[PDB]
């Protein structure tokens, strides 16, 4: 019952860059033409994704496999970032890491060659109509049991001494868990920081208390902040429609936006049995959770200060469209009870919100409009639901 929240449209936070997920046409099947439209279109039954992540293959003969989905994503208005897992094998050497032998790292004398490999990929994609928004130094340098490890100091050396030569925005360090030991050295070194454009992070097991990043708030002016890979709360086979499990996706996104100030949120495989799109090409409960943000909170909108947790089990975020000062509010109710919130939006001329609601038994159902009383919007959230107000 009667909890209160305020959305302050004059307290601007981060500009939203967008939402999306991974295509990997070497490890798994490429997205089909139909599936590309479902992912990056924003019509009814489409996810409204605006970021595609792709991998930079170690074998340049595989590069052409990325082109068809990347082009289509860009055609439908998305931006594309690319992350490598391994350098070409002729730049790699083995070493023993914490007792475990035969681990991979980039040879210290091949960092320049690696720069050239990354630029070659950038040039190749650009030649094929895919102007990459950014390229990463390494996917999960700190969880590279099955790929290429970089220590914090190896990542720093590359960012400080080589990264300035990359002909693209540079993304780093993509820690599997947003471990600050991988990024702190970049932030604390002016040359490395100058060569950084996007601080990328993954959210695997990342807790809410570790989503703020004081050093980035202090030193990261002009750099973007992106959450470039996750699945939550698990990758269990055929789990994408589990309810109320799926509510963890919305909550994680809420947390990324509000607790982490993240400008982008990017899932792992777009099409997978635990992903936003099921193998049959339709949207899963997990996908609808993503859609509550991605279909409505469009690139260029700016998050604004809003009461994040107005009552127990209720989570609120708000973004402003600066073109007309309209507001999008996404409100999660994880309670088994219904909740009523008086949302104060001082200084707004808006007096009506439309609303779409997802529960265990309905997906983005358009429900009755909210008519404001002055600048206060009283909203009711049914149990175990996500609502987007627009």
Q: Which tokens sit at 216?
A: 């980035």
In three-state secondary structure terms, 144 is: coil
Nearest CA to 38 out of 257, 290, 334, 260 is that of 290
**DSSP conformation letters of 159-184:** HHHTGGG-SS-EEEEEETT--GGGTH
Q: In what helix (H) or strand (E) does residue 71 lie, and over which residues does it extend?
A: helix 67-75
**What separation in angstroms does the CA of 308 have from each of 144, 254, 331?**
35, 9, 9
Q: Which tokens sit at 230?
A: 């996750």
Neighbours of 151 (CB within 10 A): 15
Q: Which tokens sit at 250?
A: 């919305």
What gap in Å lies between CA 235 and CA 162, rounded to an integer? 36
Which member of 58, 66, 140, 224 is catalytic?
140
What gap in Å lies between CA 138 and CA 333, rounded to an integer? 37
Which member of 66, 154, 174, 229 is catalytic?
229
Sign for the CA dihedral angle at 184, 187, 188, 192 comes to: positive
Q: Quick check: is 58 catalytic?
A: no
What gap in Å lies between CA 242 and CA 255, rounded to an integer? 20
In three-state secondary structure terms, 200 is: strand
Q: Quick check: is 367 catalytic?
A: no
Nearest CA to 280 out of 38, 20, 12 is that of 38
Which residues lie across from 161 on neighbouring strands? none
What gap in Å lies between CA 87 and CA 115, rounded to an integer? 10
What positions carry a catalytic annotation? 140, 229
């Amino acid at each position: 019952h009667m909890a209160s929240a305020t959305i302050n449209l004059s307290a601007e936070k981060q500009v939203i860059r967008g939402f999306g997920g991974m295509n990997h046409p070497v490890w798994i099947s490429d997205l089909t033409p139909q599936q590309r439209d479902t992912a990056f279109g924003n019509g009814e039954g489409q996810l409204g994704f605006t970021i595609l992540r792709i991998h930079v293959d170690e074998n340049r003969n595989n590069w052409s496999k990325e082109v068809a989905t990347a082009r289509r994503a860009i055609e439908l208005g998305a931006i594309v970032s690319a992350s490598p897992w391994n350098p070409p094998s002729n730049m790699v050497e083995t070493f023993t890491r914490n007792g475990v032998p035969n681990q991979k790292r980039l040879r210290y004398d091949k960092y320049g060659d690696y720069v050239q490999h990354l630029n070659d990929f950038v040039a190749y994609m650009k030649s094929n109509g895919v102007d990459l928004y950014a390229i990463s130094v390494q996917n999960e340098p700190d969880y590279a049991h099955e790929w290429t490890w970089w220590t914090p100091q190896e990542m720093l050396r590359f960012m400080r001494d080589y990264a300035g030569q990359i002909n693209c925005r540079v993304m780093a360090p993509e820690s599997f868990q947003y471990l600050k030991n991988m990024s702190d050295p970049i932030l604390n070194d002016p040359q490395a920081l100058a060569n950084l454009d996007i601080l990328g992070a993954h959210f695997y097991g990342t807790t809410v208390n570790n989503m703020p990043y004081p050093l980035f708030e202090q030193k990261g002016a002009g750099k973007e902040l992106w959450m470039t890979e996750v699945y939550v709360p698990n990758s269990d086979s055929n789990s994408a429609d589990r309810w109320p499990e799926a509510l963890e996706v919305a909550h994680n996104m809420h947390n990324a936006l509000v607790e982490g100030n993240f400008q982008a949120y990017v899932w792992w495989y777009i099409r997978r049995s635990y992903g936003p799109m099921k193998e049959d090409g339709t949207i899963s409960k997990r996908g609808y959770m993503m859609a509550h943000y991605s279909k409505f909170v469009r690139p260029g909108y700016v998050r604004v200060d809003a009461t994040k947790n107005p009552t127990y089990n209720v989570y609120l975020s708000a973004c402003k469209n600066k073109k007309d000062n309209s507001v999008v509010a996404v409100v999660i109710n994880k309670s088994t009870e219904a909740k009523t919130i008086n949302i104060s939006v001082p200084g707004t001329s808006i007096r009506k919100w439309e609303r779409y609601v997802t529960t265990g038994s309905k997906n983005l159902r358009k429900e009755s409009d909210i008519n404001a009383s002055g600048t206060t919007f009283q909203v009711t959230l049914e149990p175990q639901s996500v609502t987007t107000f627009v």
